[PDB]
Design an enzyme around this catalytic site. Structure first.
Site, PDB file in Angstrom:
ATOM      1  CG  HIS A  41      -0.391   0.213   2.524  1.00  0.00           C
ATOM      2  ND1 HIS A  41      -0.093  -0.828   3.377  1.00  0.00           N
ATOM      3  CD2 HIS A  41      -0.113   1.348   3.210  1.00  0.00           C
ATOM      4  CE1 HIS A  41       0.337  -0.345   4.530  1.00  0.00           C
ATOM      5  NE2 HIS A  41       0.333   0.974   4.455  1.00  0.00           N
ATOM      6  CG  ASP A  85       0.214  -4.265   2.811  1.00  0.00           C
ATOM      7  OD1 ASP A  85       0.667  -3.766   1.757  1.00  0.00           O
ATOM      8  OD2 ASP A  85      -0.222  -3.574   3.758  1.00  0.00           O
ATOM      9  N   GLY A 174       2.873   6.619   8.799  1.00  0.00           N
ATOM     10  CA  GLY A 174       4.231   6.953   8.418  1.00  0.00           C
ATOM     11  C   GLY A 174       5.191   5.792   8.620  1.00  0.00           C
ATOM     12  CB  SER A 176       2.822   1.735   6.145  1.00  0.00           C
ATOM     13  OG  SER A 176       1.587   1.708   6.838  1.00  0.00           O
ATOM     14  N   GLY A 177       5.328  -0.391   6.080  1.00  0.00           N
ATOM     15  CA  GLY A 177       6.399  -0.910   5.249  1.00  0.00           C
ATOM     16  C   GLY A 177       7.699  -1.104   6.002  1.00  0.00           C
TER      17      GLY A 177
HETATM   18  N1  LIG Z   1      -0.351  -0.374  14.047  1.00  0.00           N
HETATM   19  C1  LIG Z   1      -1.342   0.645  13.677  1.00  0.00           C
HETATM   20  C2  LIG Z   1      -0.958   1.309  12.347  1.00  0.00           C
HETATM   21  C3  LIG Z   1      -1.544   2.517  11.991  1.00  0.00           C
HETATM   22  C4  LIG Z   1      -1.215   3.122  10.777  1.00  0.00           C
HETATM   23  C5  LIG Z   1      -0.300   2.519   9.920  1.00  0.00           C
HETATM   24  N2  LIG Z   1      -0.002   3.034   8.722  1.00  0.00           N
HETATM   25  C6  LIG Z   1      -0.716   3.967   8.100  1.00  0.00           C
HETATM   26  O1  LIG Z   1      -1.708   4.527   8.576  1.00  0.00           O
HETATM   27  C7  LIG Z   1      -0.219   4.341   6.702  1.00  0.00           C
HETATM   28  C8  LIG Z   1       1.118   4.658   6.496  1.00  0.00           C
HETATM   29  O2  LIG Z   1       2.023   4.523   7.507  1.00  0.00           O
HETATM   30  C9  LIG Z   1       1.550   5.098   5.252  1.00  0.00           C
HETATM   31  C10 LIG Z   1       0.652   5.224   4.191  1.00  0.00           C
HETATM   32  C11 LIG Z   1      -0.684   4.903   4.382  1.00  0.00           C
HETATM   33  N3  LIG Z   1      -1.131   4.456   5.635  1.00  0.00           N
HETATM   34  C12 LIG Z   1      -2.554   4.095   5.818  1.00  0.00           C
HETATM   35  C13 LIG Z   1      -2.923   2.833   5.023  1.00  0.00           C
HETATM   36  N4  LIG Z   1      -3.377   2.810   3.776  1.00  0.00           N
HETATM   37  C14 LIG Z   1      -3.582   1.542   3.421  1.00  0.00           C
HETATM   38  C15 LIG Z   1      -3.254   0.764   4.449  1.00  0.00           C
HETATM   39  N5  LIG Z   1      -2.855   1.569   5.423  1.00  0.00           N
HETATM   40  C16 LIG Z   1      -2.425   1.107   6.758  1.00  0.00           C
HETATM   41  C17 LIG Z   1      -3.626   0.939   7.690  1.00  0.00           C
HETATM   42  C18 LIG Z   1      -3.453   1.051   9.066  1.00  0.00           C
HETATM   43  C19 LIG Z   1      -4.535   0.870   9.924  1.00  0.00           C
HETATM   44  C20 LIG Z   1      -5.793   0.577   9.405  1.00  0.00           C
HETATM   45  C21 LIG Z   1      -5.967   0.466   8.028  1.00  0.00           C
HETATM   46  C22 LIG Z   1      -4.888   0.648   7.172  1.00  0.00           C
HETATM   47  C23 LIG Z   1       0.285   1.314  10.282  1.00  0.00           C
HETATM   48  C24 LIG Z   1      -0.043   0.705  11.496  1.00  0.00           C
END
Ligand SMILES: NCc1ccc(NC(=O)c2c(O)ccc[n+]2Cc2nccn2Cc2ccccc2)cc1
Length: 222
Positions: A41, A85, A174, A176-177
């Site tokens: 994502h 993912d 921020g 994610s990944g």
């Molecule tokens: N552990 C809780 C958590 C909360 C947020 C995230 N990440 C994000 O919100 C995120 C990011 O770091 C960078 C880009 C986009 N996002 C949001 C996102 N878009 C698609 C998937 N996600 C992560 C997501 C995180 C929580 C609920 C649903 C989706 C990862 C983990």
């Protein structure tokens, strides 16, 4: 990520920062001089990958910036459920490894014992702001059974749950990944979980990297 602290400067040579349009987008993990692993994502046009970084605002002598020449999302990635993912990024130029840039070995054993982990990232902190300095937090893997109980019907074999009952240490926007590291091997990638973040409510959910040994291998060798 929340309730952590700044990482030891020499302890995160595998951490990548992904930017697009000049702003932080995601974390990532160097797993090969040519390849960074991240969440599916996180795919956007014109990705810039930064290696060797500790503080985002600073122009650090150790840092390396690179474009991407191939982004390979897993063919079965399901965006709605976050199943599978995972994405491989081929760097426009091989990482110049150094004392501060180095790949992290993968955990290949899906049955691995070790549940003591840490996560890293520049995602939102507990105060609601975004840190300049890379953060680290210790968290613990939960069993598949407990993972399934936390999110009934929504957890696949390609997902891991991890969290911390004492403070609620958790990944956040921020992050994610970025890597979930257990026993000093790459075990997971930050994928999803609770929002607002905090793992006392429910554990964070991570892509189960051990499931993708073959696909990663096939992809890097194509
Ligand atoms: N552990 C809780 C958590 C909360 C947020 C995230 N990440 C994000 O919100 C995120 C990011 O770091 C960078 C880009 C986009 N996002 C949001 C996102 N878009 C698609 C998937 N996600 C992560 C997501 C995180 C929580 C609920 C649903 C989706 C990862 C983990």
């Amino acid at each position: 990520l929340v309730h952590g602290g700044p990482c030891d400067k020499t302890s995160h040579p595998y951490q990548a920062a992904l930017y697009t349009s000049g702003h932080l987008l995601c974390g990532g993990v160097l797993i090969h001089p040519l390849w960074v692993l991240t969440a599916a994502h996180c795919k956007k046009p014109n990705l810039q990958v930064f290696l060797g970084k500790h503080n985002l605002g600073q122009q650090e002598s150790s840092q390396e910036q690179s474009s991407v020449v191939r982004a390979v999302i897993h063919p079965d990635y399901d965006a709605a459920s976050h199943d599978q993912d995972i994405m491989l990024l081929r760097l426009a130029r091989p990482a110049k490894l150094s004392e501060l840039i180095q790949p992290l070995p993968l955990e290949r054993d899906c049955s691995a014992q070790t549940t003591s982990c840490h996560i890293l990232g520049w995602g939102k902190t507990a105060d609601g702001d975004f840190p300049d300095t890379i953060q680290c937090a210790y968290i613990h893997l939960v069993s598949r059974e407990e993972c399934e109980h936390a999110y009934p019907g929504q957890i696949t074999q390609n997902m891991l749950c991890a969290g911390d009952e004492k403070y609620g240490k958790d990944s956040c926007q921020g992050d994610s990944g970025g890597p979930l590291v257990c026993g000093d091997h790459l075990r997971g990638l930050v994928s999803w979980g609770n929002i607002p973040c905090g793992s006392k409510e429910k554990p964070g959910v991570y892509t189960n990297v051990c499931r993708y040994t073959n696909w990663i291998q096939k992809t890097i060798q194509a």
